[PDB]
Amino acid sequence: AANSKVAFSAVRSTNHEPSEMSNKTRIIYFDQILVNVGNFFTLESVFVAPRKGIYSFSFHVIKVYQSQTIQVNLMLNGKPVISAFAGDKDVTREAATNGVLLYLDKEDKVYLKLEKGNLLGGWQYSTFSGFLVFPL
Amino acid sequence: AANSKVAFSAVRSTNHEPSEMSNKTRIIYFDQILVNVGNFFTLESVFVAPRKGIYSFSFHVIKVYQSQTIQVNLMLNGKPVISAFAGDKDVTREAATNGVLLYLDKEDKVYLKLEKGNLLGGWQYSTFSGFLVFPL
Amino acid sequence: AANSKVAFSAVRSTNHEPSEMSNKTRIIYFDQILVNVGNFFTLESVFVAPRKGIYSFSFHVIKVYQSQTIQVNLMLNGKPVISAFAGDKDVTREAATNGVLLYLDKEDKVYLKLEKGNLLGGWQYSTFSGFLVFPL
Ligand SMILES: *[C@@H]1O[C@H](CO)[C@@H](O)[C@H](O)[C@H]1NC(C)=O
Ligand SMILES: *[C@@H]1O[C@H](CO)[C@@H](O)[C@H](O)[C@H]1NC(C)=O
Ligand SMILES: *[C@@H]1O[C@H](CO)[C@@H](O)[C@H](O)[C@H]1NC(C)=O
């Protein structure tokens, strides 16, 4: 727990339907916390950068069945930064997955929003993780 | 080769059918070692954590043709931790890919098991990699 | 900007057709630079290792529509090291994604080449990122 050590990792462990709040914010959440060094990943959904630096993020959102399609956005402070897609009607399961490095200021917020579609059948096995590569 | 420096990366370089041992253990292996700092990735398949800390892992298992479906599990000490899927009959090639951070104790073992399906046509171009993000 | 701190991340921000030069080299490029600490990622396409060490790389190339198929190769000094595929005619959007750790000498060049297919409809939302895990 030095301040150079910041990481989190989370999974959706069940096929439960989305909560009301997730339903309105459209923000995807992950209930099983595998890693949360620094406790800067809060509300099962959003990471708050503790300091200025480069941060790695990666996500893998699985649609149990066709949705029809979903578009997942990686959000930084209310603006979409990266996008991923899961599309075909016949194909299940399909995953909207992507990853990236980001320059973050202290208090910056990174999280996943669902732009299109919904996680109706649950999004079990979906993953969200990130860490501080180095401070700046 | 300081003890803070631990990483491995591996690929399946051919389309050869699985070995007998892999056939019985159902544990996926990777013959071409790109990186293995610390030599803690052994038997082409399993990583043994040298010390307590946070470790990144990612995998990308490719089914050459429909299997029909495969489910790949990321294993920690005999228990499944993360899962990925490659499904459709018509779609080739499809990949079961996922990744995660894990809190590991010294001597913890992380590896890939094939829960469903088999790698009959070979799993060429498949990748397995991981590293120590920081010690704890 | 210490010499242990090396990272880059890039996105294709539009659906514009490939440039003439990209057309001839078959080398994929990314116009929106999210991160480029050390400025060792140049020409929107190729990373030049500043020092000996282990480097993480990951890519996610999206074909807007069927191509028919694309094969993307991760190149190190003119030789393919890792491969990824996006295949089916009916499926859009599909992604050729993969990642890996590599042992790199100073001046080594890592970049993405398009072995099969073409990025005709654009490759918007595609990502290419990498960083120095540790020096050796
Ligand atoms: C949430 O919004 C969806 C549309 O995405 C709607 O169909 C559903 O009924 C709403 N409520 C809940 C609890 O899911
Ligand atoms: C291994 O097990 C599979 C079932 O997954 C079986 O069909 C095959 O014949 C077995 N032996 C070998 C060498 O693959
Ligand atoms: C580039 O090469 C492709 C084949 O991949 C060709 O069809 C196209 O006309 C060429 N020129 C441009 C500007 O894309």
Side-chain angles (χ1 to χ4, degrees):
Chain A
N3 206 22
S4 49
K5 306 179 180 183
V6 177
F8 77 94
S9 202
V11 222
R12 184 51 171 173
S13 60
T14 72
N15 59 16
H16 293 11
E17 66 155 62
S19 67
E20 250 282 280
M21 188 184 176
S22 175
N23 222 68
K24 298 186 181 175
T25 63
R26 295 202 87 175
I27 293 175
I28 298 168
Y29 63 96
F30 304 81
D31 60 285
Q32 173 155 100
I33 314 302
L34 302 186
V35 168
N36 195 7
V37 176
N39 295 321
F40 300 114
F41 181 72
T42 190
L43 231 47
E44 305 194 327
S45 48
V46 15
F47 167 80
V48 188
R51 64 188 288 183
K52 175 152 62 103
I54 299 304
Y55 294 76
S56 176
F57 296 96
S58 64
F59 66 92
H60 179 94
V61 175
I62 316 187
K63 58 169 185 58
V64 168
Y65 167 66
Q66 69 109 4
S67 186
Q68 194 155 346
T69 85
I70 66 164
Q71 171 186 340
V72 169
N73 275 3
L74 180 68
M75 308 289 301
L76 165 52
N77 294 333
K79 298 318 282 168
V81 170
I82 291 300
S83 305
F85 303 85
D88 194 12
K89 235 184 184 177
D90 243 344
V91 179
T92 109
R93 298 171 186 250
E94 199 186 340
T97 182
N98 211 335
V100 65
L101 306 186
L102 285 180
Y103 175 102
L104 261 36
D105 285 309
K106 187 180 174 186
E107 301 304 316
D108 276 349
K109 293 155 227 295
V110 168
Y111 53 98
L112 304 175
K113 192 189 254 171
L114 195 57
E115 254 303 292
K116 272 126 203 168
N118 50 45
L119 280 359
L120 232 44
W123 63 107
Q124 195 184 11
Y125 308 117
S126 294
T127 54
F128 187 25
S129 27
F131 60 94
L132 172 70
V133 185
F134 51 77
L136 282 170
Chain B
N3 206 22
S4 49
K5 306 179 180 183
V6 177
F8 77 94
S9 202
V11 222
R12 184 51 171 173
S13 60
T14 72
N15 59 16
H16 293 11
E17 66 155 62
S19 67
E20 250 282 280
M21 188 184 176
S22 175
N23 222 68
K24 298 186 181 175
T25 63
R26 295 202 87 175
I27 293 175
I28 298 168
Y29 63 96
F30 304 81
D31 60 285
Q32 173 155 100
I33 314 302
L34 302 186
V35 168
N36 195 7
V37 176
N39 295 321
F40 300 114
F41 181 72
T42 190
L43 231 47
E44 305 194 327
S45 48
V46 15
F47 167 80
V48 188
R51 64 188 288 183
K52 175 152 62 103
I54 299 304
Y55 294 76
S56 176
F57 296 96
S58 64
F59 66 92
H60 179 94
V61 175
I62 316 187
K63 58 169 185 58
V64 168
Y65 167 66
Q66 69 109 4
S67 186
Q68 194 155 346
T69 85
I70 66 164
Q71 171 186 340
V72 169
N73 275 3
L74 180 68
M75 308 289 301
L76 165 52
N77 294 333
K79 298 318 282 168
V81 170
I82 291 300
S83 305
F85 303 85
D88 194 12
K89 235 184 184 177
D90 243 344
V91 179
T92 109
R93 298 171 186 250
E94 199 186 340
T97 182
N98 211 335
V100 65
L101 306 186
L102 285 180
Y103 175 102
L104 261 36
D105 285 309
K106 187 180 174 186
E107 301 304 316
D108 276 349
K109 293 155 227 295
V110 168
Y111 53 98
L112 304 175
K113 192 189 254 171
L114 195 57
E115 254 303 292
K116 272 126 203 168
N118 50 45
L119 280 359
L120 232 44
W123 63 107
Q124 195 184 11
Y125 308 117
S126 294
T127 54
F128 187 25
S129 27
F131 60 94
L132 172 70
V133 185
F134 51 77
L136 282 170
Chain C
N3 206 22
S4 49
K5 306 179 180 183
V6 177
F8 77 94
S9 202
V11 222
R12 184 51 171 173
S13 60
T14 72
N15 59 16
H16 293 11
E17 66 155 62
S19 67
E20 250 282 280
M21 188 184 176
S22 175
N23 222 68
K24 298 186 181 175
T25 63
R26 295 202 87 175
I27 293 175
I28 298 168
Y29 63 96
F30 304 81
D31 60 285
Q32 173 155 100
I33 314 302
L34 302 186
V35 168
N36 195 7
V37 176
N39 295 321
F40 300 114
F41 181 72
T42 190
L43 231 47
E44 305 194 327
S45 48
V46 15
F47 167 80
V48 188
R51 64 188 288 183
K52 175 152 62 103
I54 299 304
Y55 294 76
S56 176
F57 296 96
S58 64
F59 66 92
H60 179 94
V61 175
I62 316 187
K63 58 169 185 58
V64 168
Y65 167 66
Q66 69 109 4
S67 186
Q68 194 155 346
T69 85
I70 66 164
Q71 171 186 340
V72 169
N73 275 3
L74 180 68
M75 308 289 301
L76 165 52
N77 294 333
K79 298 318 282 168
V81 170
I82 291 300
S83 305
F85 303 85
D88 194 12
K89 235 184 184 177
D90 243 344
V91 179
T92 109
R93 298 171 186 250
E94 199 186 340
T97 182
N98 211 335
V100 65
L101 306 186
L102 285 180
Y103 175 102
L104 261 36
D105 285 309
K106 187 180 174 186
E107 301 304 316
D108 276 349
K109 293 155 227 295
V110 168
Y111 53 98
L112 304 175
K113 192 189 254 171
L114 195 57
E115 254 303 292
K116 272 126 203 168
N118 50 45
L119 280 359
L120 232 44
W123 63 107
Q124 195 184 11
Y125 308 117
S126 294
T127 54
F128 187 25
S129 27
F131 60 94
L132 172 70
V133 185
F134 51 77
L136 282 170

PDB file of all heavy atoms in Angstrom, chain B residues 17-18 20 23 118, ligand 2:
ATOM      1  N   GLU B  17      -2.242 -31.336 -32.604  1.00  0.00           N
ATOM      2  CA  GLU B  17      -3.304 -31.776 -31.706  1.00  0.00           C
ATOM      3  C   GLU B  17      -2.733 -31.795 -30.278  1.00  0.00           C
ATOM      4  O   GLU B  17      -1.514 -31.887 -30.082  1.00  0.00           O
ATOM      5  CB  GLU B  17      -3.800 -33.183 -32.126  1.00  0.00           C
ATOM      6  CG  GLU B  17      -2.753 -34.305 -31.955  1.00  0.00           C
ATOM      7  CD  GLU B  17      -3.369 -35.704 -31.768  1.00  0.00           C
ATOM      8  OE1 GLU B  17      -4.062 -36.183 -32.685  1.00  0.00           O
ATOM      9  OE2 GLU B  17      -3.188 -36.342 -30.703  1.00  0.00           O
ATOM     10  N   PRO B  18      -3.607 -31.716 -29.273  1.00  0.00           N
ATOM     11  CA  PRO B  18      -3.154 -31.709 -27.872  1.00  0.00           C
ATOM     12  C   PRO B  18      -2.450 -33.015 -27.471  1.00  0.00           C
ATOM     13  O   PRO B  18      -2.838 -34.105 -27.931  1.00  0.00           O
ATOM     14  CB  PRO B  18      -4.482 -31.576 -27.076  1.00  0.00           C
ATOM     15  CG  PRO B  18      -5.442 -30.970 -28.058  1.00  0.00           C
ATOM     16  CD  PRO B  18      -5.067 -31.555 -29.393  1.00  0.00           C
ATOM     17  N   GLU B  20      -1.284 -36.099 -24.880  1.00  0.00           N
ATOM     18  CA  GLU B  20      -2.055 -36.989 -24.028  1.00  0.00           C
ATOM     19  C   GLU B  20      -2.266 -36.423 -22.626  1.00  0.00           C
ATOM     20  O   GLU B  20      -3.360 -36.500 -22.051  1.00  0.00           O
ATOM     21  CB  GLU B  20      -1.349 -38.335 -23.932  1.00  0.00           C
ATOM     22  CG  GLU B  20      -2.074 -39.460 -24.646  1.00  0.00           C
ATOM     23  CD  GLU B  20      -3.236 -39.964 -23.850  1.00  0.00           C
ATOM     24  OE1 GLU B  20      -2.987 -40.769 -22.915  1.00  0.00           O
ATOM     25  OE2 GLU B  20      -4.391 -39.553 -24.170  1.00  0.00           O
ATOM     26  N   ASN B  23      -4.533 -33.742 -22.618  1.00  0.00           N
ATOM     27  CA  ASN B  23      -5.820 -34.349 -22.872  1.00  0.00           C
ATOM     28  C   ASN B  23      -6.497 -34.800 -21.578  1.00  0.00           C
ATOM     29  O   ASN B  23      -7.717 -34.722 -21.427  1.00  0.00           O
ATOM     30  CB  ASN B  23      -5.640 -35.545 -23.788  1.00  0.00           C
ATOM     31  CG  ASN B  23      -6.678 -35.623 -24.839  1.00  0.00           C
ATOM     32  OD1 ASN B  23      -6.722 -34.773 -25.744  1.00  0.00           O
ATOM     33  ND2 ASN B  23      -7.504 -36.638 -24.770  1.00  0.00           N
ATOM     34  N   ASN B 118     -12.991 -29.123 -26.869  1.00  0.00           N
ATOM     35  CA  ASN B 118     -11.613 -29.579 -26.988  1.00  0.00           C
ATOM     36  C   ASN B 118     -10.894 -28.813 -28.109  1.00  0.00           C
ATOM     37  O   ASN B 118     -11.520 -28.265 -29.007  1.00  0.00           O
ATOM     38  CB  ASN B 118     -11.562 -31.074 -27.248  1.00  0.00           C
ATOM     39  CG  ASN B 118     -12.463 -31.504 -28.391  1.00  0.00           C
ATOM     40  OD1 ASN B 118     -12.515 -30.880 -29.473  1.00  0.00           O
ATOM     41  ND2 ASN B 118     -13.197 -32.593 -28.148  1.00  0.00           N
TER      42      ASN B 118
HETATM   43  C1  LIG D   2      -8.474 -36.700 -25.820  1.00  0.00           C
HETATM   44  O1  LIG D   2      -9.794 -36.433 -25.369  1.00  0.00           O
HETATM   45  C2  LIG D   2     -10.648 -36.105 -26.456  1.00  0.00           C
HETATM   46  C3  LIG D   2     -11.950 -35.489 -25.960  1.00  0.00           C
HETATM   47  O2  LIG D   2     -11.745 -34.120 -25.708  1.00  0.00           O
HETATM   48  C4  LIG D   2     -10.783 -37.356 -27.344  1.00  0.00           C
HETATM   49  O3  LIG D   2     -11.751 -37.169 -28.359  1.00  0.00           O
HETATM   50  C5  LIG D   2      -9.384 -37.709 -27.902  1.00  0.00           C
HETATM   51  O4  LIG D   2      -9.447 -38.898 -28.662  1.00  0.00           O
HETATM   52  C6  LIG D   2      -8.427 -37.925 -26.732  1.00  0.00           C
HETATM   53  N1  LIG D   2      -7.056 -38.254 -27.101  1.00  0.00           N
HETATM   54  C7  LIG D   2      -6.227 -37.472 -27.812  1.00  0.00           C
HETATM   55  C8  LIG D   2      -4.807 -37.906 -28.104  1.00  0.00           C
HETATM   56  O5  LIG D   2      -6.557 -36.381 -28.232  1.00  0.00           O
END
